[PDB]
Short mmCIF file of C-alpha atoms in Angstrom, two decimals:
data_model
loop_
_atom_site.label_atom_id
_atom_site.label_comp_id
_atom_site.label_asym_id
_atom_site.label_seq_id
_atom_site.Cartn_x
_atom_site.Cartn_y
_atom_site.Cartn_z
CA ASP S 1 2.29 4.86 7.80
CA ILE S 2 2.75 7.79 10.18
CA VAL S 3 1.49 11.12 8.82
CA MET S 4 2.72 14.49 10.12
CA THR S 5 0.61 17.66 9.99
CA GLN S 6 1.79 21.18 10.81
CA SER S 7 -0.27 24.27 11.69
CA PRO S 8 -0.19 26.93 10.41
CA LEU S 9 1.46 26.41 7.05
CA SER S 10 2.36 30.12 6.80
CA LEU S 11 3.25 32.12 9.92
CA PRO S 12 3.99 35.86 9.71
CA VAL S 13 5.32 37.20 13.01
CA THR S 14 6.10 40.72 14.11
CA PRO S 15 9.79 40.80 15.11
CA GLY S 16 10.15 40.46 18.86
CA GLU S 17 6.79 38.69 19.16
CA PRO S 18 6.53 34.99 20.07
CA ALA S 19 5.67 32.25 17.60
CA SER S 20 4.15 28.79 17.90
CA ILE S 21 4.02 25.89 15.42
CA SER S 22 1.88 22.83 16.10
CA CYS S 23 2.76 19.34 14.87
CA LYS S 24 0.48 16.30 15.08
CA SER S 25 1.27 12.71 14.07
CA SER S 26 -1.13 9.96 13.01
CA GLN S 27 0.34 7.58 15.61
CA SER S 28 2.13 8.03 18.91
CA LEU S 29 5.87 8.70 18.69
CA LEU S 30 6.65 7.58 22.25
CA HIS S 31 8.93 4.56 22.58
CA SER S 32 7.92 2.21 25.38
CA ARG S 33 11.50 1.23 26.27
CA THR S 34 13.52 4.44 25.80
CA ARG S 35 10.62 6.67 26.95
CA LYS S 36 11.59 9.17 24.22
CA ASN S 37 9.35 10.93 21.70
CA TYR S 38 11.24 10.56 18.41
CA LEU S 39 10.18 13.89 16.94
CA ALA S 40 12.55 16.59 15.71
CA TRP S 41 12.30 20.18 14.48
CA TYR S 42 14.46 21.30 11.54
CA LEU S 43 14.77 24.80 10.07
CA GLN S 44 15.59 25.32 6.39
CA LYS S 45 16.62 28.89 5.63
CA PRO S 46 16.51 30.23 2.07
CA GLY S 47 19.04 28.50 -0.15
CA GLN S 48 20.35 26.19 2.56
CA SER S 49 20.00 22.59 3.63
CA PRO S 50 17.89 21.81 6.70
CA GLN S 51 19.48 22.19 10.12
CA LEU S 52 18.48 20.37 13.30
CA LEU S 53 16.92 22.56 15.99
CA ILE S 54 15.19 20.17 18.40
CA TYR S 55 15.23 16.41 19.00
CA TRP S 56 13.41 14.06 21.36
CA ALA S 57 10.52 16.55 21.18
CA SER S 58 11.99 19.01 23.70
CA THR S 59 15.81 18.78 23.76
CA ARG S 60 17.53 21.76 22.13
CA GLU S 61 20.51 20.99 19.90
CA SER S 62 23.89 22.44 20.86
CA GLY S 63 24.26 26.00 19.60
CA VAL S 64 20.56 26.68 18.94
CA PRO S 65 19.50 29.86 20.80
CA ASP S 66 17.42 29.48 23.95
CA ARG S 67 14.42 31.25 22.39
CA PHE S 68 13.73 28.01 20.50
CA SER S 69 11.93 25.44 22.64
CA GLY S 70 10.09 22.18 21.99
CA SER S 71 7.31 20.52 23.96
CA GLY S 72 4.69 17.82 23.70
CA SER S 73 4.47 14.05 23.76
CA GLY S 74 2.67 11.17 22.10
CA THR S 75 0.93 12.79 19.12
CA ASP S 76 0.76 16.53 19.97
CA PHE S 77 3.92 18.64 19.80
CA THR S 78 4.75 22.33 19.64
CA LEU S 79 7.73 24.45 18.65
CA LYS S 80 7.90 27.85 20.34
CA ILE S 81 10.06 30.92 19.69
CA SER S 82 9.97 33.38 22.58
CA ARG S 83 11.25 36.35 20.54
CA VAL S 84 11.13 35.98 16.76
CA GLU S 85 14.16 37.63 15.16
CA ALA S 86 14.90 38.48 11.55
CA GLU S 87 17.34 35.58 11.14
CA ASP S 88 14.59 33.05 11.92
CA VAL S 89 12.69 33.37 8.63
CA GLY S 90 12.49 30.11 6.73
CA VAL S 91 10.61 26.83 6.61
CA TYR S 92 10.24 24.87 9.86
CA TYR S 93 9.66 21.13 9.49
CA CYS S 94 8.77 18.59 12.14
CA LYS S 95 9.96 15.06 11.42
CA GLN S 96 9.12 11.78 13.15
CA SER S 97 11.66 8.96 13.41
CA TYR S 98 9.77 6.53 15.66
CA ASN S 99 8.92 4.27 12.71
CA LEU S 100 10.62 5.25 9.47
CA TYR S 101 10.81 8.99 8.83
CA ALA S 102 8.19 11.56 7.84
CA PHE S 103 8.28 15.35 7.52
CA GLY S 104 5.45 17.79 8.04
CA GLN S 105 4.30 20.07 5.26
CA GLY S 106 6.51 22.85 6.63
CA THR S 107 5.68 26.25 8.13
CA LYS S 108 7.12 29.27 6.33
CA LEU S 109 7.99 31.81 9.02
CA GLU S 110 7.90 35.30 7.47
CA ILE S 111 7.95 38.84 8.85
CA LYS S 112 4.73 40.64 9.73
CA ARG S 113 4.50 44.28 8.63
CA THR S 114 1.82 46.95 8.33
CA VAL S 115 -0.41 46.75 5.27
CA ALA S 116 1.22 48.36 2.24
CA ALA S 117 -0.65 49.07 -0.97
CA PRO S 118 1.10 48.01 -4.20
CA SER S 119 2.27 50.45 -6.83
CA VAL S 120 0.87 49.20 -10.14
CA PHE S 121 2.63 49.79 -13.46
CA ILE S 122 1.94 48.57 -16.99
CA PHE S 123 4.57 48.14 -19.71
CA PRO S 124 3.34 47.58 -23.28
CA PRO S 125 5.25 45.31 -25.68
CA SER S 126 8.47 46.70 -27.09
CA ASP S 127 9.01 47.42 -30.76
CA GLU S 128 11.77 44.79 -30.93
CA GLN S 129 9.52 42.02 -29.61
CA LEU S 130 6.75 42.70 -32.14
CA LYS S 131 9.22 42.01 -34.97
CA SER S 132 9.35 38.38 -33.79
CA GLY S 133 5.59 37.77 -33.93
CA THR S 134 4.81 37.86 -30.20
CA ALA S 135 3.88 40.53 -27.66
CA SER S 136 4.24 40.54 -23.87
CA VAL S 137 2.42 43.08 -21.70
CA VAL S 138 3.86 43.34 -18.19
CA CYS S 139 1.95 44.38 -15.07
CA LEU S 140 4.01 45.17 -11.97
CA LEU S 141 2.81 45.28 -8.37
CA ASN S 142 5.55 46.88 -6.31
CA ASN S 143 6.23 46.80 -2.56
CA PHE S 144 3.00 45.59 -0.94
CA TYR S 145 1.94 43.53 2.06
CA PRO S 146 0.50 41.08 2.74
CA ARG S 147 1.28 38.81 -0.21
CA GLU S 148 -2.39 38.08 -0.98
CA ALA S 149 -3.22 40.02 -4.15
CA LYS S 150 -5.19 39.35 -7.33
CA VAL S 151 -4.36 40.54 -10.85
CA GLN S 152 -6.88 40.41 -13.71
CA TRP S 153 -6.14 41.15 -17.37
CA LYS S 154 -8.73 43.04 -19.42
CA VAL S 155 -8.29 43.63 -23.17
CA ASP S 156 -11.06 45.92 -24.43
CA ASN S 157 -12.75 45.18 -21.07
CA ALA S 158 -12.67 41.46 -21.98
CA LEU S 159 -11.37 39.43 -19.04
CA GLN S 160 -8.42 37.24 -20.02
CA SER S 161 -7.65 33.74 -18.77
CA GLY S 162 -4.97 31.13 -19.34
CA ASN S 163 -2.59 33.53 -21.11
CA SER S 164 -0.92 35.26 -18.13
CA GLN S 165 2.14 34.22 -16.12
CA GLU S 166 2.66 35.39 -12.55
CA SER S 167 5.84 35.69 -10.46
CA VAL S 168 6.34 37.04 -6.93
CA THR S 169 9.58 37.94 -5.15
CA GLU S 170 10.52 36.79 -1.67
CA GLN S 171 9.96 39.11 1.26
CA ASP S 172 12.30 42.08 0.94
CA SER S 173 15.00 42.08 3.60
CA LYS S 174 14.79 45.85 4.14
CA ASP S 175 11.09 46.77 4.05
CA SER S 176 9.52 43.27 4.18
CA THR S 177 7.34 43.92 1.12
CA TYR S 178 6.49 41.81 -1.92
CA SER S 179 6.56 42.43 -5.65
CA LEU S 180 4.67 40.63 -8.41
CA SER S 181 5.06 40.64 -12.19
CA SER S 182 2.25 39.32 -14.39
CA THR S 183 2.99 38.84 -18.08
CA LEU S 184 0.23 38.58 -20.68
CA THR S 185 1.48 36.84 -23.82
CA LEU S 186 -0.32 37.43 -27.12
CA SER S 187 0.38 36.97 -30.79
CA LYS S 188 1.37 40.13 -32.64
CA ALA S 189 -1.63 39.53 -34.90
CA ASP S 190 -4.03 39.10 -31.99
CA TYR S 191 -2.27 41.95 -30.16
CA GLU S 192 -2.81 44.54 -32.90
CA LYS S 193 -6.49 43.54 -33.20
CA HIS S 194 -7.31 45.30 -29.89
CA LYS S 195 -6.59 48.74 -28.45
CA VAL S 196 -7.02 48.96 -24.66
CA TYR S 197 -4.89 46.71 -22.42
CA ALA S 198 -5.16 46.89 -18.64
CA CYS S 199 -4.51 45.02 -15.42
CA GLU S 200 -6.82 45.36 -12.42
CA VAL S 201 -5.18 44.80 -9.03
CA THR S 202 -7.15 43.82 -5.93
CA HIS S 203 -5.33 44.09 -2.60
CA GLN S 204 -6.22 44.68 1.04
CA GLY S 205 -4.41 48.03 1.07
CA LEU S 206 -6.58 49.42 -1.75
CA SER S 207 -10.05 50.78 -1.05
CA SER S 208 -11.06 49.71 -4.57
CA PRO S 209 -9.54 47.61 -7.37
CA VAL S 210 -6.88 49.73 -9.06
CA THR S 211 -6.96 49.57 -12.86
CA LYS S 212 -3.85 50.41 -14.91
CA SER S 213 -4.45 50.71 -18.65
CA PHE S 214 -2.97 51.89 -21.92
CA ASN S 215 -4.19 52.22 -25.50
CA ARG S 216 -2.07 50.48 -28.13
CA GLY S 217 -0.10 52.98 -30.18
CA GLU S 218 -0.29 55.97 -27.81
CA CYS S 219 2.76 57.65 -26.27
CA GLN P 1 34.77 18.57 11.08
CA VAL P 2 32.04 16.36 9.61
CA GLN P 3 31.09 17.15 6.01
CA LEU P 4 28.76 15.64 3.42
CA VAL P 5 29.65 17.09 0.00
CA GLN P 6 27.41 16.27 -2.96
CA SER P 7 28.12 16.56 -6.67
CA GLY P 8 27.16 19.48 -8.90
CA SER P 9 23.94 20.28 -10.72
CA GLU P 10 22.66 17.87 -13.37
CA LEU P 11 20.67 18.63 -16.53
CA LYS P 12 19.07 15.61 -18.22
CA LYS P 13 16.44 14.82 -20.85
CA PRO P 14 13.32 12.77 -20.06
CA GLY P 15 14.32 9.11 -20.17
CA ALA P 16 18.01 9.20 -19.23
CA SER P 17 19.72 8.29 -15.95
CA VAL P 18 21.63 10.33 -13.40
CA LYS P 19 24.08 9.51 -10.61
CA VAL P 20 24.52 11.91 -7.69
CA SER P 21 27.37 11.42 -5.24
CA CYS P 22 27.61 12.19 -1.53
CA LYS P 23 31.12 12.05 -0.06
CA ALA P 24 31.44 11.92 3.73
CA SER P 25 34.34 13.09 5.88
CA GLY P 26 35.12 13.68 9.54
CA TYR P 27 33.67 10.40 10.87
CA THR P 28 33.75 6.66 10.27
CA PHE P 29 31.60 6.50 7.13
CA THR P 30 30.62 2.85 7.61
CA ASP P 31 29.17 3.36 11.10
CA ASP P 32 26.01 5.35 10.32
CA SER P 33 23.50 4.96 7.51
CA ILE P 34 23.05 7.49 4.70
CA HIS P 35 19.54 8.80 4.02
CA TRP P 36 18.16 10.60 0.97
CA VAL P 37 15.57 13.38 0.98
CA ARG P 38 13.93 14.91 -2.08
CA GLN P 39 12.65 18.48 -2.29
CA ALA P 40 10.72 19.54 -5.36
CA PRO P 41 11.06 23.26 -6.18
CA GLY P 42 8.81 25.14 -3.79
CA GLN P 43 7.77 21.93 -2.01
CA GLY P 44 8.59 20.27 1.29
CA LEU P 45 11.08 17.61 2.30
CA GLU P 46 10.28 13.97 1.56
CA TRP P 47 12.31 11.05 2.90
CA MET P 48 13.29 8.73 0.04
CA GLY P 49 14.99 5.96 2.01
CA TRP P 50 18.42 5.01 3.28
CA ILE P 51 21.43 2.78 2.68
CA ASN P 52 23.43 0.76 5.19
CA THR P 53 26.98 2.09 4.84
CA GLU P 54 28.48 -1.18 6.14
CA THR P 55 26.59 -3.82 4.14
CA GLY P 56 25.34 -1.70 1.24
CA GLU P 57 21.73 -2.86 1.58
CA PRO P 58 19.25 -0.16 0.48
CA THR P 59 15.80 0.49 1.90
CA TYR P 60 13.43 2.57 -0.23
CA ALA P 61 10.40 4.56 0.83
CA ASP P 62 7.11 3.50 -0.72
CA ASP P 63 6.90 6.62 -2.89
CA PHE P 64 10.45 6.04 -4.22
CA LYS P 65 10.42 2.27 -4.89
CA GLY P 66 11.21 1.64 -8.55
CA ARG P 67 13.49 3.94 -10.54
CA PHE P 68 15.76 4.93 -7.62
CA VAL P 69 18.93 3.06 -6.65
CA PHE P 70 21.06 3.66 -3.54
CA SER P 71 24.61 2.48 -4.22
CA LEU P 72 27.80 2.68 -2.19
CA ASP P 73 31.58 2.87 -2.43
CA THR P 74 33.29 2.64 0.96
CA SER P 75 36.79 2.85 -0.51
CA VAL P 76 36.13 6.58 -0.99
CA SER P 77 33.39 6.98 1.66
CA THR P 78 30.79 7.90 -0.95
CA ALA P 79 27.10 7.13 -1.25
CA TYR P 80 25.36 7.35 -4.62
CA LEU P 81 21.80 8.06 -5.73
CA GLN P 82 20.84 6.85 -9.20
CA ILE P 83 17.65 7.64 -11.11
CA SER P 84 16.82 5.77 -14.32
CA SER P 85 14.13 6.64 -16.87
CA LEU P 86 14.03 10.24 -15.69
CA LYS P 87 10.72 12.06 -16.07
CA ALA P 88 9.82 15.73 -15.75
CA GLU P 89 8.60 15.38 -12.16
CA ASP P 90 12.07 14.25 -11.05
CA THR P 91 13.36 17.84 -11.24
CA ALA P 92 14.21 18.66 -7.62
CA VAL P 93 16.99 19.04 -5.05
CA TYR P 94 18.29 15.78 -3.59
CA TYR P 95 19.92 15.84 -0.15
CA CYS P 96 21.92 13.17 1.60
CA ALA P 97 21.99 13.16 5.39
CA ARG P 98 23.82 11.22 8.09
CA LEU P 99 21.55 9.51 10.62
CA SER P 100 22.77 9.84 14.17
CA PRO P 101 21.68 7.00 16.49
CA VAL P 102 20.10 7.24 19.94
CA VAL P 103 18.63 10.63 19.03
CA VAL P 104 17.64 9.29 15.56
CA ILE P 105 17.91 12.61 13.69
CA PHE P 106 19.73 14.19 10.74
CA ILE P 107 22.39 16.50 12.16
CA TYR P 108 24.73 16.59 9.14
CA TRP P 109 23.38 17.24 5.63
CA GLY P 110 24.81 17.82 2.18
CA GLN P 111 24.32 21.05 0.27
CA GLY P 112 21.96 19.18 -2.06
CA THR P 113 22.19 18.43 -5.77
CA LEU P 114 19.79 19.99 -8.25
CA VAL P 115 18.55 17.61 -10.95
CA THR P 116 16.63 19.26 -13.80
CA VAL P 117 14.80 17.11 -16.35
CA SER P 118 13.43 18.83 -19.44
CA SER P 119 13.15 17.94 -23.11
CA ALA P 120 14.18 21.51 -23.97
CA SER P 121 17.53 22.46 -25.50
CA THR P 122 20.07 25.07 -24.49
CA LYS P 123 19.10 28.52 -25.77
CA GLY P 124 20.21 32.08 -25.12
CA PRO P 125 17.58 34.54 -23.89
CA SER P 126 16.01 37.54 -25.60
CA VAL P 127 16.15 40.89 -23.80
CA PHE P 128 13.42 43.47 -24.41
CA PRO P 129 13.01 46.86 -22.72
CA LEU P 130 10.13 47.75 -20.43
CA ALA P 131 10.30 51.51 -20.97
CA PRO P 132 9.00 54.05 -18.43
CA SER P 133 6.33 56.55 -19.37
CA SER P 134 3.50 58.45 -17.70
CA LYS P 135 1.94 55.07 -16.87
CA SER P 136 5.08 54.21 -14.85
CA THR P 137 5.46 57.34 -12.66
CA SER P 138 3.93 57.29 -9.16
CA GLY P 139 4.90 60.04 -6.74
CA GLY P 140 7.97 61.18 -8.66
CA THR P 141 9.36 57.63 -8.96
CA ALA P 142 9.24 55.79 -12.27
CA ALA P 143 9.56 52.06 -12.91
CA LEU P 144 11.57 50.60 -15.78
CA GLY P 145 12.87 47.15 -16.53
CA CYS P 146 13.97 44.37 -18.83
CA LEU P 147 12.11 41.26 -19.98
CA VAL P 148 14.41 38.25 -20.45
CA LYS P 149 12.36 35.65 -22.33
CA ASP P 150 12.79 32.30 -24.05
CA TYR P 151 16.01 30.86 -22.63
CA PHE P 152 16.90 27.37 -21.41
CA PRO P 153 18.20 26.42 -18.93
CA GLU P 154 18.41 28.58 -15.81
CA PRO P 155 20.11 30.47 -14.39
CA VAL P 156 20.23 33.94 -15.95
CA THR P 157 21.91 36.81 -14.09
CA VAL P 158 20.60 40.35 -14.49
CA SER P 159 22.41 43.50 -13.37
CA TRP P 160 21.66 47.21 -13.72
CA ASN P 161 24.36 49.66 -14.87
CA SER P 162 26.97 46.90 -14.45
CA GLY P 163 26.01 46.32 -10.82
CA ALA P 164 26.16 50.00 -9.84
CA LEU P 165 22.38 50.28 -9.35
CA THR P 166 20.95 48.03 -6.64
CA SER P 167 18.35 50.12 -4.80
CA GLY P 168 14.79 49.57 -5.96
CA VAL P 169 15.78 46.61 -8.15
CA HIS P 170 13.48 43.58 -8.28
CA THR P 171 14.47 40.59 -10.42
CA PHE P 172 11.59 38.13 -10.29
CA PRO P 173 12.08 34.36 -10.26
CA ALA P 174 11.92 32.86 -13.74
CA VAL P 175 8.62 31.28 -14.79
CA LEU P 176 8.58 28.15 -16.96
CA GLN P 177 6.54 28.83 -20.09
CA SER P 178 4.44 26.29 -21.97
CA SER P 179 7.18 26.13 -24.62
CA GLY P 180 9.64 24.62 -22.13
CA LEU P 181 11.70 27.83 -21.93
CA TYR P 182 12.04 30.25 -19.04
CA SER P 183 11.11 33.92 -18.82
CA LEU P 184 11.59 36.54 -16.10
CA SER P 185 11.65 40.31 -15.64
CA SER P 186 14.01 42.63 -13.79
CA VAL P 187 12.52 45.97 -12.75
CA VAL P 188 13.90 49.01 -10.96
CA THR P 189 12.36 52.12 -9.42
CA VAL P 190 14.28 55.36 -9.95
CA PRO P 191 13.56 59.06 -9.45
CA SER P 192 11.74 60.20 -12.59
CA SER P 193 13.74 63.45 -12.37
CA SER P 194 16.87 61.59 -13.56
CA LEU P 195 15.38 60.06 -16.72
CA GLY P 196 16.85 62.79 -18.92
CA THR P 197 20.24 62.83 -17.20
CA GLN P 198 20.80 59.18 -16.20
CA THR P 199 21.00 56.19 -18.55
CA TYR P 200 19.80 52.75 -17.47
CA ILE P 201 21.17 49.59 -19.11
CA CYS P 202 20.38 46.08 -17.90
CA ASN P 203 23.14 43.50 -18.37
CA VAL P 204 21.82 39.96 -18.88
CA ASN P 205 24.36 37.14 -18.62
CA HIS P 206 23.36 33.58 -19.52
CA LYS P 207 26.29 31.20 -19.04
CA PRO P 208 24.73 27.95 -20.39
CA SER P 209 24.59 29.82 -23.75
CA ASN P 210 27.58 32.17 -23.37
CA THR P 211 25.29 35.14 -24.02
CA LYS P 212 25.90 38.65 -22.65
CA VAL P 213 23.37 41.30 -23.72
CA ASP P 214 23.40 44.91 -22.51
CA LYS P 215 20.03 46.50 -23.30
CA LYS P 216 19.58 50.21 -22.63
CA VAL P 217 16.01 50.97 -21.53
CA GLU P 218 15.05 54.41 -22.83
CA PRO P 219 11.81 56.20 -21.92
CA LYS P 220 9.05 56.30 -24.53
CA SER P 221 8.03 59.72 -25.86
CA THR O 2 26.38 0.59 52.36
CA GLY O 3 25.25 -2.73 50.87
CA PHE O 4 22.30 -4.74 49.58
CA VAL O 5 19.52 -3.00 51.50
CA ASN O 6 20.95 0.30 50.24
CA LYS O 7 20.22 -0.57 46.58
CA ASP O 8 18.27 2.60 45.80
CA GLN O 9 20.96 4.78 47.36
CA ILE O 10 23.86 3.06 45.61
CA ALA O 11 22.18 3.18 42.21
CA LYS O 12 21.43 6.86 42.78
CA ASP O 13 25.13 7.44 43.42
CA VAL O 14 26.26 5.38 40.44
CA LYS O 15 23.94 7.34 38.16
CA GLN O 16 25.30 10.57 39.62
CA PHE O 17 28.83 9.29 39.03
CA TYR O 18 27.94 8.57 35.41
CA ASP O 19 26.49 12.05 35.01
CA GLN O 20 29.68 13.61 36.34
CA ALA O 21 31.85 11.58 33.98
CA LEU O 22 29.53 12.36 31.08
CA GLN O 23 29.57 16.05 31.86
CA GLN O 24 33.37 16.03 32.05
CA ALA O 25 33.70 13.93 28.90
CA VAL O 26 32.03 16.40 26.54
CA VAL O 27 32.90 19.71 28.21
CA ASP O 28 36.67 19.25 28.09
CA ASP O 29 39.27 17.51 25.94
CA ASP O 30 41.83 16.87 28.70
CA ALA O 31 39.32 14.66 30.53
CA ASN O 32 40.39 11.37 28.99
CA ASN O 33 39.59 9.26 32.03
CA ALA O 34 36.02 10.57 32.04
CA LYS O 35 35.76 9.71 28.34
CA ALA O 36 37.08 6.21 29.06
CA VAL O 37 34.62 5.84 31.95
CA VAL O 38 31.61 6.87 29.88
CA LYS O 39 32.69 4.65 26.97
CA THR O 40 33.04 1.71 29.37
CA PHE O 41 29.60 2.37 30.88
CA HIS O 42 28.04 2.62 27.41
CA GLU O 43 29.69 -0.60 26.21
CA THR O 44 29.22 -2.67 29.38
CA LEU O 45 25.65 -1.57 30.15
CA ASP O 46 24.65 -1.20 26.46
CA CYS O 47 23.41 2.34 26.97
CA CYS O 48 24.16 5.88 25.80
CA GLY O 49 23.45 9.21 27.47
CA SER O 50 21.90 10.47 30.69
CA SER O 51 18.18 10.84 31.35
CA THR O 52 18.86 14.05 33.30
CA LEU O 53 21.51 15.51 30.95
CA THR O 54 19.66 14.84 27.71
CA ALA O 55 20.94 18.06 26.08
CA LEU O 56 24.43 16.48 26.14
CA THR O 57 23.51 13.47 23.99
CA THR O 58 24.61 14.92 20.65
CA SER O 59 27.89 16.09 22.20
CA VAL O 60 28.38 12.53 23.48
CA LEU O 61 27.87 11.28 19.93
CA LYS O 62 30.05 14.02 18.47
CA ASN O 63 32.86 12.75 20.71
CA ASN O 64 32.32 9.15 19.55
CA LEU O 65 31.56 8.02 23.09
CA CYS O 66 28.73 5.64 22.12
CA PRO O 67 29.96 2.55 20.28
CA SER O 68 27.08 1.67 17.93
CA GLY O 69 26.38 3.38 14.62
CA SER O 70 23.03 3.91 12.93
CA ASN O 71 23.19 1.11 10.35
CA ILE O 72 21.54 -1.45 12.66
CA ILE O 73 18.01 -0.50 13.68
CA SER O 74 18.48 -2.29 17.01
CA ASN O 75 21.01 0.41 17.94
CA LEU O 76 18.95 3.45 16.93
CA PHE O 77 16.78 3.21 20.05
CA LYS O 78 19.30 2.94 22.88
CA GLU O 79 18.21 3.42 26.47
CA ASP O 80 19.97 5.98 28.64
CA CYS O 81 22.41 4.65 31.21
CA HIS O 82 20.20 5.52 34.18
CA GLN O 83 17.74 2.83 33.06
CA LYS O 84 20.59 0.37 32.52
CA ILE O 85 22.07 1.13 35.95
CA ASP O 86 18.63 0.51 37.46
CA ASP O 87 18.39 -2.78 35.56
CA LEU O 88 21.85 -3.74 36.85
CA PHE O 89 21.05 -3.12 40.51
CA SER O 90 17.62 -4.79 40.30
CA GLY O 91 17.14 -8.38 39.22
CA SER O 92 15.08 -7.81 36.07
CA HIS O 93 15.03 -5.19 33.30
#
């Protein structure tokens, strides 16, 4: 069929700066009779259904601010935002309707901020949890940017794998930072067999990988 | 005003069926076709197909030809999406949309219906403290939190001091464990000078299990 | 103004349509403009203006174009400038 491709798939913009999203289709979207390019741009904001921004490649829908503009024809199309504002964050999709319907992968427009190093914290398992036969060690990366960051779990300097969950929050509305929580799950038996538990964080804001550790049974 | 209102969230076990409704208002329902779009959690939009609101004939997209049925009831201006033999990968948000002609776009959408398919059973969470210490103090600010683990199904609401403490709070999205249950953590950053004078209690409320647990996170000596 | 003025007359008719179309969506007292645009759409089997494309959705929101989206033949409708041209020329 017709395949849609968007670039880039993740676009962080400094507020007030312009933004551009490219959209390319496998086949031409130009109708020979109507002379229209049946390509549209939708924006899906967090927790909302998609809304129509642009249709026929370059016609702006009623009510959409003038800073949104569409252009292109045939197979190459572009969505431009003259001044990116805070309310514009969300996933932008291009969709063709020349033959059937197909959406692009989507471009997540986020806010660009200065690099911020994460604050790393480690919480050992609670006494209540150990009574159930399982332990969870939590590593917290707090308020950092960009999102790209690596966490590694070392138990007695032994790198762990396949036993850690990872969760990241959406970009904070006030300071535009991210937070991540990694949780290492172990059995109480296999937890009490070792002493040192640590998480090593690698991020652009850190000159060197920051290691946060604790010895089991030390206050 | 044109409105497409879909039915509420659905929770099913692998192998059952589910029927989502999409009621239209504000325009002649039988003029324009009704299209369906699926969105897996954290994934993009995918067109599933459409249904002719005048004849009732469905047209399915190649990736959705099989276990999906587009049905219709014009007496109440309602389209229906049915899924039989539900599998785990069917968990997603399903939107209906009205196709406008000439421009050939989706101006009017529904709020979407979440369908969750999991062999797990309803279960209240477990709340453990994540106590602050000297490993949790950075620049006079200490981090504390609560770990809400082993609970199905979402959602779970977490508050601090009965909603009085909001600054510095981060409640992470739940992560699905290998056991089929969910687990998340709610952390908060507070001045470490108030650990001896201020008390911090996280209130976890899980409605699918009618569970309300208030766990006070005390610092570890 | 007659046969040898084809291009001019068509240009005027298109302009007339535009005016009606603009009046039909901008205001709700303009019922004659709405009737005019509906008659153009139905008689010429068209919908919208090639110069006032940004108005198309408004035109649809006002139910000025008679065909829905169930029939694929009606999804891709030509604007009325093309249909006016086809009317004043012999072919399409």
